[PDB]
Design an enzyme around this catalytic site. Structure first.
Site, PDB file in Angstrom:
ATOM      1  N   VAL A 159       0.857  -1.219   0.000  1.00 59.69           N
ATOM      2  CA  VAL A 159       0.000   0.000   0.000  1.00 59.69           C
ATOM      3  C   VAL A 159       0.882   1.253   0.000  1.00 59.69           C
ATOM      4  CG1 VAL A 159      -1.923  -1.211   1.056  1.00 59.69           C
ATOM      5  CG2 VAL A 159      -0.232  -0.011   2.513  1.00 59.69           C
ATOM      6  N   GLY A 182       8.530   3.868  -0.948  1.00 58.91           N
ATOM      7  CA  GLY A 182       9.270   5.131  -1.078  1.00 58.91           C
ATOM      8  C   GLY A 182      10.673   4.962  -0.554  1.00 58.91           C
ATOM      9  N   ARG A 183      11.340   6.079  -0.315  1.00 66.29           N
ATOM     10  CA  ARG A 183      12.692   6.100   0.292  1.00 66.29           C
ATOM     11  C   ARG A 183      12.622   5.534   1.724  1.00 66.29           C
ATOM     12  N   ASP A 214       7.797  15.351  12.504  1.00 65.79           N
ATOM     13  CA  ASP A 214       7.482  15.152  11.063  1.00 65.79           C
ATOM     14  C   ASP A 214       5.972  15.072  10.864  1.00 65.79           C
ATOM     15  OD1 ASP A 214       7.998  14.917   8.327  1.00 65.79           O
ATOM     16  OD2 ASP A 214       8.351  12.744   8.459  1.00 65.79           O
TER      17      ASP A 214
END
Ligand SMILES: COc1cc(-c2cncc(-c3ccc(C4CCN(C)CC4)cc3)c2C)cc(OC)c1OC
Ligand SMILES: COc1cc(-c2cncc(-c3ccc(C4CCN(C)CC4)cc3)c2C)cc(OC)c1OC
Ligand SMILES: COc1cc(-c2cncc(-c3ccc(C4CCN(C)CC4)cc3)c2C)cc(OC)c1OC
Ligand SMILES: COc1cc(-c2cncc(-c3ccc(C4CCN(C)CC4)cc3)c2C)cc(OC)c1OC
Lengths: 290, 286
Positions: free
Chosen positions: A8, A11-12, A127
């Site tokens: 799902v 990424g990095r 974040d």
């Protein structure tokens, strides 16, 4: 036993899978080897039993596994099939009730993080963004990704900033993060970075709330003023040099809810970090808004 | 798609302590050892996990890492460390009921020195490692393998470049003179503890039909569960060292091992042998 069913996200950071465990959907994050310090930090944070909260992503297990020179790093959580707030806002508009439910739930999670329990240390996220908020079937959200978190205990005068060279998502970084003047040995500094980012998420959500038959399209913060895939320096330019803040659509000022929200997001965006509202004050203000 | 079989069957408890418990477990077609941590000792799980997240140690004389597992429970966090399983158990256990010949004694002590030198050495580049000091080396933290070599266990107090076991503490730890900002200080504390382990093993090596009974270091001068003060008086104030029996001086191997152990026990930490020098000395014996 866990069965990995479908990817799902990739990424990095690594990858997230929807899996099955004891006949329930679970989310399985497999970290990139580049991000092993986030895995360990997130594991330190989830060790805290009193972290558990309706508006924080629920932990099931964390694993580090190895044979020979290969290491895998796993985090297993509750699965939210509606996906992130970022995903959700692109395909839905909101009414007043849903908009306030979403933003109050995020405020509730963030105040829970920020406020020490005497236990759970005070925690700053570092974040916060709409991809790090999951949408739940009850219309509330939960905050995810504690890999960059900082912990503080008032009772023992201890600050744990951790060892992780990761930095926040550039688009959401506060002025003092982008200009690198942030006071790194001051816990309140990190809470005020979260408040800045929360203001941006408020703006992203409020754009999708209909008033008087008008709504804005989904856009990420600063979409109009930076390149695609903005660099650290791109963001520093607009936030610190140009003193840019997200624009408030004038249609908001016809609606009492959006007028209250605009006031609240402006009080998250002062260049002076100590002027910004606290998470508790945001939660109390949203509780009173209708 | 991928089944991730995580079920471990806990079959028998092979250790219980203040640390928690160790179990023999079964995963698929591997016996594994599972350390379940007490709340008392959670920091040891975090430290060993942080170290293995930093460097995946792989060495024949280091207990082999398999997994670190954290599981959410109703009212607590459960912390497991999963490693290779050594059915022969700890060196402490093994020496109680086994005597050694020259080959088996040297193989044991050289394997421990090999594991310790691997911890201590900084290796540069990809597939390198930071220097590591163990900080709780003792015979209970050494496992015996079926091939006659040993491996070093328990990196819960390790440091990379909640106090160690008092019986094995170096004089500079007991008198609080240790140079705590100098990484070499921690290597030299391990060398002291190595010398004590070397003494424990050498006692069980037969020569001319003679062997000593198993005893722990300082068994003749401190009580069981000696205090910090008990140890400081013996090691720091009176500067006692473990006894070398006369019968060792009839045997060339035990004569060489006695000299080696005395070069691990200097009061002055910087006079002690390095793990690499101990290896070299051991390879030239017999
Ligand atoms: C944790 O411990 C054990 C794990 C396993 C195990 C089970 N499935 C898959 C794997 C695996 C496959 C492939 C790669 C690599 C191959 C090359 N490149 C492409 C990078 C990826 C890594 C890992 C493993 C190692 C088996 C064990 O015992 C037999 C373990 O020990 C108990
Ligand atoms: C942020 O961080 C973490 C998140 C999660 C997590 C938990 N439930 C659901 C999800 C999810 C499911 C599905 C979609 C959809 C969106 C639309 N799109 C077109 C298809 C995909 C998005 C998101 C995720 C990503 C787990 C994590 O750890 C296990 C996280 O890390 C802490
Ligand atoms: C989460 O937890 C535990 C997991 C396991 C375990 C069981 N089967 C397979 C695995 C596996 C290994 C490695 C890969 C690689 C394959 C190729 N590459 C491209 C990326 C990934 C995939 C799968 C693991 C790690 C064992 C456990 O205990 C012994 C676990 O619990 C501590
Ligand atoms: C020192 O520390 C750790 C040790 C181990 C560990 C690894 N293999 C085997 C063992 C073991 C097996 C069997 C017996 C007994 C059972 C039958 N008989 C009456 C005598 C022999 C004792 C011991 C252990 C205890 C694992 C650890 O972590 C998972 C340790 O902690 C780092």
């Amino acid at each position: 036993d866990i069965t990995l069913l479908e990817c799902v996200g990739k990424g990095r950071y690594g990858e997230v899978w929807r899996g099955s465990w004891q006949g329930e959907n679970v989310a399985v994050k497999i970290f990139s080897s580049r991000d092993e310090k986030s895995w360990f930090r997130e594991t330190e944070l989830y060790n805290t039993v009193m972290l558990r909260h309706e508006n924080i992503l629920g932990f099931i297990a964390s694993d580090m596994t190895s044979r020979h020179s290969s290491t895998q790093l796993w985090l297993i959580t509750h699965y939210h099939e509606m996906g992130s707030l970022y995903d959700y806002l692109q395909l839905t508009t909101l009414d007043t009730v849903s908009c306030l439910r979403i933003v109050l739930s995020i405020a509730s999670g963030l105040a829970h993080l920020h406020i020490e329990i005497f236990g759970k240390p005070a925690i700053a996220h570092r974040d916060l963004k709409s991809k790090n908020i999951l949408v739940k079937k009850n219309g509330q959200c939960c905050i995810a990704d504690l890999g960059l978190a900082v912990m503080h205990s008032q009772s023992t005068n201890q600050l744990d900033v951790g060892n992780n060279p990761r930095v926040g998502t550039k688009r959401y970084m506060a002025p003092e993060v982008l200009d690198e003047t942030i006071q790194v040995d001051c816990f309140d500094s990190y809470k005020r970075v979260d408040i800045w980012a929360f203001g941006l998420v408020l703006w992203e959500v409020a754009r999708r709330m209909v008033s008087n038959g008008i709504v804005e399209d989904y856009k990420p913060p600063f979409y109009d003023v930076v390149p695609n895939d903005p660099s650290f320096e791109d963001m520093r330019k607009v936030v610190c040099v140009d003193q840019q803040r997200p624009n408030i659509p004038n249609r908001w000022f016809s609606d009492p809810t959006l007028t209250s929200l605009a006031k609240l997001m402006k009080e998250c965006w002062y260049q002076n970090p100590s002027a910004r509202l606290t998470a508790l004050r945001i939660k109390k203000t949203l509780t009173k808004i209708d």
